[PDB]
Amino acid sequence: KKRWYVVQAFSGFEGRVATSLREHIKLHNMEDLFGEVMVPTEEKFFPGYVLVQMVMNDASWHLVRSVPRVMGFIGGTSDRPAPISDKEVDAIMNRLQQVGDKPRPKTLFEPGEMVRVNDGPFADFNGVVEEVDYEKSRLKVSVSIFGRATPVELDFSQVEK
Amino acid sequence: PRSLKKGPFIDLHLLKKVEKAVESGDKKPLRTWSRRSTIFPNMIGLTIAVHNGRQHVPVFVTDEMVGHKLGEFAPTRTYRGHA
Amino acid sequence: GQKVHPNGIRLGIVKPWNSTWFANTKEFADNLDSDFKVRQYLTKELAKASVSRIVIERPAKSIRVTIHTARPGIVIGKKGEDVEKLRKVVADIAGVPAQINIAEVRKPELDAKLVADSITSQLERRVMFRRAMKRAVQNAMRLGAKGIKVEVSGRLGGAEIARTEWYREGRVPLHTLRADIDYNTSEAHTTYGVIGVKVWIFKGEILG
Amino acid sequence: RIRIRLKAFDHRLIDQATAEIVETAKRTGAQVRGPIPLPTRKERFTVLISPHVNKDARDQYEIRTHLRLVDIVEPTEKTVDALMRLDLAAGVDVQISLG
Amino acid sequence: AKQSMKAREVKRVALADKYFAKRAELKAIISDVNASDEDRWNAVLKLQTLPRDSSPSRQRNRCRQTGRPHGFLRKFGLSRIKVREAAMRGEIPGLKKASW
RNA sequence: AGAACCUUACCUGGUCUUGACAUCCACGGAAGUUUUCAGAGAUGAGAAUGUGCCUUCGGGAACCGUGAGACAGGUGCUGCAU
RNA sequence: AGGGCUACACACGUGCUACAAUGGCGCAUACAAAGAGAAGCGACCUCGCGAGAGCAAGCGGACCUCAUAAAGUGCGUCGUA
């Protein structure tokens, strides 16, 4: 049975830490002592901690701390470092490296009702967008104008999430 | 007629009844209002008294009746002649 | 059903609209319905108050009502007590922020609708219809109407055979589009049946 | 550029609105494009006017929706914001659109 | 129209409002050529199970004032007769008698 | 200015009776949300959630439930009462 | 819920399509106006003989879509059945 553990890396080199960790596993061939390795890296939460399915021998502990650009485990003590949970890393798994935003046929920025318009007349302005015309690349952001809530057809690039 | 992709139509309840009858091996007539129901291969042999608006008229199902619907064998209007 | 409606034929020229808003095909029907509701409510409420014309005007998701009434005092009641009360109910009816204005009708004898209403009331309280009609006509004339016509119809004096009678005074040109013809109607729900009252009041011709 | 689509049933009212908008634009900013009249929508309706029956008896109504296209070429900081204050005549649906 | 009819209409509308998401989904499933036969069958049966008044093709457009089924207009939500009256009164904005 | 269902007012059966639609109290329950078997369906029986605006606590306004009646309802007749 | 208003010896009213060559069919090709459109109009492209289907932009619209106007014109054919 392999339980989960938290590894701290130099924040920003996290995907390279994950790749080097998989490679150190397949070098020192303790293949039966490692299950998975979650190391996200957006163009990113959590952009600083690497989740490792593992068991605890002192050999595997020295292995993970001999992986380069790794500070150490995070637990109660450094003798016997602490597991956490499977659900904690579970959330990260879903969006580990899945196509998040970016490559989209319409929405370039989360609509909801929080955006700012700058590529137009609305100099340093923000408003709430109820409906949106992504198909025809149009937004109905209701910016506080004329003492009310009148919307204005804005451009996706013109506005900013 | 109905689209081939949609399949044949039979009322669910009617179908269930038919199934029950089959299970039993009984030949007592099943009174039914589903005139819109298509006849099925398993319904062959059964008497099924189809409503014509007014009364249930007994229809002994045959090999030839399969593709047809139950309402086809239960005429509603009752015209004898003008003289 | 010979005659064209005198208000309706003149909306483009000398008469204005009551409901005065723009809406796309989406929200138009709903708006109309709302207007109907609010107007109905107002009529129900301000029956005892002499009310001529409710003018609805909705800009920017907020309804502006304008009540034309002969006596504001009974519609307003105490210093913004009754008006305020009316407002919230109006808002509720609409589903938007409400604003009630109250226009004071100068010369209620020259306002046609008001006159009609009065006549109806008279009929209801069992006066001689003819005498009422005469009063209506005379009063308007006195007040400075270029002309007036009034017409009442059906079960007059509770008679079995219904008929219509009408009194004209001065000139009341209906074919002339530029004539300011204040037309309006009412209905007396008497013991013998309904008695419909029409009244045309010719203020004068507009030159433009 | 700010395109502005004025829509109304009364033409005079619309005209008034347009002028006002122009005025608002012109004091603050510079080079207002102009009040360009688009085609009017004459949405017609026929109805039977009898309560019961008489089909040749009819009234033909219409709603003339007028369009005014006002454009503003240079959106400054003062100009665009100004719109909020300057209140125009009622029953005139405006539709501003930057770019 | 009667009160009863109006009530019925209202009920139908309510039902439509309620069951739209499910019904639509079912329809989609039925349509989808890239799908299992059994699944399709189930969907078809499922639809049957749902109430009839849930369909939007059940509800008739009636006049919003009188409930008159015939002579209806969509823009106004009113039957011809009432529409005309409204027009005459000035109650429909922009609407006036047209000649050309 | 549009009857497959709906529309529909008509026929056949199956059903309801202060009622599908309103107002009023009394008092049982927050509304509603999801799902189960029988039934042609109407309807007739089950499992999960909630207690918001305020109380010298005899309780309330929205929204279901039951009984009493006051009433609702009628595209029923008279266009030769209007 | 199902049926009926869609019944059918018959009579009348109002229409459409015809009986043809001033035409029918085939191939090419020209010139409109006025409207509608968001639980909507739906290009292009792909598949289907076709009705359509799939994918899916542009568009609350002098912008995009419905949407190729047809009679016509030219060339061929049929030759009064």
Swiss-Prot record, chain C:
Check the UniProt entry and state the signal peptide residues, or none.
none
| Keyword terms | Ribonucleoprotein, Ribosomal protein, RNA-binding, rRNA-binding
This one is known as Small ribosomal subunit protein uS3
Pfam families, from UniProt? KH_2, Ribosomal_S3_C
Q: Superkingdom of this entry's organism?
A: Bacteria
- InterPro entries referenced in this protein's UniProt entry, alphabetically: KH_dom (IPR004087), KH_dom-like_a/b (IPR015946), KH_dom_type_2 (IPR004044), KH_sf_prok-type (IPR009019), Ribosomal_S3_C_sf (IPR036419), Ribosomal_uS3_bac-typ (IPR005704), Ribosomal_uS3_C (IPR001351), Ribosomal_uS3_CS (IPR018280)
Q: Which GO terms describe its molecular function?
A: mRNA binding; rRNA binding; structural constituent of ribosome
One of the GO BP terms on file = translation
Q: What Gene Ontology terms describe where this protein resides (cellular component)?
A: cytosolic small ribosomal subunit
Would you identify the family this protein belongs to, as annotated?
Belongs to the universal ribosomal protein uS3 family.
Purpose? Binds the lower part of the 30S subunit head. Binds mRNA in the 70S ribosome, positioning it for translation.
Q: Assembly and partners?
A: Part of the 30S ribosomal subunit. Forms a tight complex with proteins S10 and S14.
Reply yes or no: does the keyword Ribonucleoprotein apply: yes
